[PDB]
Amino acid sequence: APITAYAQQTRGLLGCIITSLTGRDKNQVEGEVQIVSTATQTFLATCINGVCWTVYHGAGTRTIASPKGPVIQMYTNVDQDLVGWPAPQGSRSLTPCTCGSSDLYLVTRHADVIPVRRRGDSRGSLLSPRPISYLKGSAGGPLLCPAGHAVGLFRAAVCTRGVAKAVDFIPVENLETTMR
Amino acid sequence: QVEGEVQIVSTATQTFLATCINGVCWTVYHGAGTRTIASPKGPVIQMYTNVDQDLVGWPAPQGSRSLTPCTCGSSDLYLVTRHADVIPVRRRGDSRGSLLSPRPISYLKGSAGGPLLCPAGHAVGLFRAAVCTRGVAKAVDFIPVENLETTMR
């Protein structure tokens, strides 16, 4: 706090495809949140406690490309819409939040930080609504408390006429449950 | 190609800050006056000049990007200084806040025009002036971002 964010693109279309098939990625890894792609979808993966987490509806059961070839998921939970791999070498992890706060901040793939008012275990409303296409490709990204600790992972938008008014997320607690 | 939301600016006698919000480069009247801002194509005139509010605005320059205004109504603020230090501030009234840890006045010197941020990094206000007791800044006076929004209208 203040929470601020920037984005960097590390790969183009062609290199992504080639790396996708080979599963071998020699690029250096930095940051807490990874922008990730498959052949058909781009979305986010957030590192929390040494594990790199993302949504199942984006990753399926896929491996992640790494410097040593493909790496298999450590955790998979279709119901919770959740997947995890060991955090890449060089990444940096967030810490789960223990203030129980109700003011949240969603970090999007554009590196914006948008405020969210918590209204339930795994639900929060936007203080200012957004085109659904804005939030698209942000699943897997973190909801943060005022201290920059992780509260949840963006899963789904509550949308109407193409306008997202609220967000549905996976609470950190559920990660702990998925680990067990 | 990295862009900055905050400019470090100078007149012949002063140095202070400006902040870009919503396409406008804003700073304090008591620093800029009615002055134009320099550009590689020559002077650019103010788009807004509001003396009551101590507020001045030019179109945002090259090498800059705009801050988004705060919409979360938080009272935990963060002032950013010309040295890029971050100073936590608790909001008291519309246009006042107090430091969590008071500092010598020289620590805030030359930072007027800088932003006050909420936990989200959005703009809450523009730092107007240090509220001082015997060389020690204990509070801050600032221009709330609402005032910038209405000035534009």
Binding site: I3, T4, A5, Y6, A7, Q8, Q9, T10, R11, C16, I17, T19, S20, L21, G23, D25, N27, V29, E30, G31, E32, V33, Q34, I35, V36, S37, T38, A39, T42, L44, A45, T54, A59, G60, T61, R62, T63, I64, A65, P70, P88, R92, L94, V107, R109, A111, G141, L144, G148 | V2, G4, V6, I8, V80, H83, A84, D85, V86
Partner: peptide
């Protein structure tokens, strides 16, 4: 099925800085 690939990153831990010349 292809591997998931890191195409970019988002950095939260950066702090305000003066942009170097």
């Amino acid at each position: 099925k292809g591997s998931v690939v890191i195409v970019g990153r988002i950095v939260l831990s950066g702090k305000p800085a003066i942009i170097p010349k």
